[PDB]
Amino acid sequence: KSVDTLLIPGPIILSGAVQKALDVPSLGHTSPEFVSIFQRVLKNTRAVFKSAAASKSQPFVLAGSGTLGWDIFASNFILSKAPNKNVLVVSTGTFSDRFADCLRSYGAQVDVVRPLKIGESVPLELITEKLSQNSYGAVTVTHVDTSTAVLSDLKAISQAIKQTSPETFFVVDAVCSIGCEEFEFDEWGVDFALTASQKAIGAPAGLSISLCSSRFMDYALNDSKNGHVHGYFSSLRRWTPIMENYEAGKGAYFATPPVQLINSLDVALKEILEEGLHKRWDLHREMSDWFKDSLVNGLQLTSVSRYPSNMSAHGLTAVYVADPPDVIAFLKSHGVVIAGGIHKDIGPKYIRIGHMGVTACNKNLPYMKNCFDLIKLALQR
């Protein structure tokens, strides 16, 4: 027997290079050789977000998970003397909501705008409407909500913000979009974007990867004006000098970074950048279309996210099924792991499949053809 094929929306299967890049002896975090690795990582992190070094945006890579990104933004936005604590949360599913929770836990007055139906993005006009009737210090959008597998139009939302409330910070939960979905940090005027290491970036789990715009960084570190951070580990003020030195190939110290994880992430970022982001987004699209096509049209199923449509993310598939547990158990027995629903409402009414990174790209891995064949067979009983 072998290891099961991971086809859930994070963690995902790692390419050989990034996986064996984990099995490496420990390096001192301030050693010249580790400093080399992290420097590349920080610069490739901004690149992967589609941010130019000239934008003066500040990248942050630290031990934690995607979720840390929420704490980081909240803790650095809702400072002690925060002038505007109102945040407007654009919800497309479970994670948007959980982000809303995190926000509130930090002292932010949160407003939630939702879609007209589950599996859809929030209407743009409703977002601008909300952006007008009130003045939010920040607005969040979950680029791809993994619970509903819904894709939000960041280009549109970013323009509505620039148009209706330019001063409000544009925060994007890109955990399940960076690496497989078109995402333009600089172009779309994103102030804070956060992603994880185990989704489309194709790295091991254990890292929080976020990026700060010059504008937000300007706000976050203005102690005399906005006050201080009610926290510590998540303090941008404390980590900036560290990320700065590392990018300058200097090496300093606040909290020991995950050397093995950073080494792995180094390879993972190179791989997505060596072949090109656009190319990598197209592969995910091709994979996603073929698969939903097979599921929705081929097996006459219904997608949780509207399909076909630009509302359906390319990093995963969420399709309703009669008996999700049975389908999941069936695939499991045959060496394939897919996921359940995780959603306050439709939770046990559907299943979720991965198809990100090497499993989406790299047309030699039969992972997905086999996945579909199995689901196909699972619905036979």
Ligand X SMILES: *Cc1c(COP(=O)(O)O)cnc(C)c1O
Instruction: Please tell me whether residue 230 binds a second copy under the rule CB under 8 A.
Output: yes
| Pairwise CA distance, residues 355 & 123, whole Å | 27
Partner in contact with 55, chosen from ligand X, a second copy, none, beta carbon below 5 to 8 Å by kind: none
Instruction: Please tell me whether residue 239 binds a second copy under the rule CB under 8 A.
Output: no
CA distances in angstroms from 93 to 24, 96, 294, 307, 343, listed in the order given: 38, 6, 24, 16, 7
Instruction: Please tell me whether residue 95 binds ligand X under the rule CB under 6 A.
Output: yes
Beta pairing class for 138-142 and 169-173: parallel
Per the CB < 8 A criterion, the answer to whether 4 and 328 are in contact is no
Instruction: Please tell me whether residue 214 binds ligand X under the rule CB under 6 A.
Output: no
Nearest distance from residue 183's CB to ligand X, in Å?
A: 13
| Pairwise CA distance, residues 184 & 219, whole Å | 21
Instruction: Please tell me whether residue 93 binds a second copy under the rule CB under 8 A.
Output: no
Instruction: Please tell me whether residue 167 binds a second copy under the rule CB under 8 A.
Output: no
Q: Which is nearer to a second copy, 46 or 199 (CB)?
A: 199
Secondary-structure breakdown of the chain: helix, strand, coil percentages, each rounded to the nearest 5: 40, 15, 45
| Pairwise CA distance, residues 298 & 98, whole Å | 34
| Pairwise CA distance, residues 181 & 280, whole Å | 9
Instruction: Please tell me whether residue 154 binds ligand X under the rule CB under 6 A.
Output: no
Neighbours of 323 (CB within 10 A): 15
Instruction: Please tell me whether residue 302 binds a second copy under the rule CB under 8 A.
Output: no
Q: At a CB cut-off of 8 Å and minimum separation 6, what does 218 contact? A: none
Contacting residue, 43, 85, 107, 270, with a second copy by CB under 8 A: 107
| Pairwise CA distance, residues 163 & 250, whole Å | 41
Q: At a CB cut-off of 8 Å and minimum separation 6, what does 85 contact? A: 78, 107, 108, 109, 137
Instruction: Please tell me whether residue 178 binds a second copy under the rule CB under 8 A.
Output: no
Contacting residue, 235, 288, 303, 305, with a second copy by CB under 8 A: 235
Partner in contact with 204, chosen from a second copy, ligand X, none, beta carbon below 5 to 8 Å by kind: a second copy
CA distances in angstroms from 326 to 319, 320, 349, listed in the order given: 14, 13, 12
Instruction: Please tell me whether residue 253 binds a second copy under the rule CB under 8 A.
Output: yes
Q: Which stretch binds a second copy (CB under 8 A): 57-65, 176-184, 218-226, 310-318?
A: 57-65
Q: Which is nearer to a second copy, 17 or 126 (CB)?
A: 17
Instruction: Please tell me whether residue 10 binds ligand X under the rule CB under 6 A.
Output: yes
Binding site for ligand X (CB under 6 A): 10, 65-67, 95, 142, 144-146, 173, 175-176, 196, 255-256
Residue list for the binding site: 352
Residue list for the binding site for substrate: 352
Binding site for a second copy (CB under 8 A): 3-4, 6, 8, 10-14, 19-20, 22-31, 33, 63-68, 70-71, 74-75, 101-102, 105-107, 196, 198, 204-208, 228-235, 253-261, 337, 339, 342
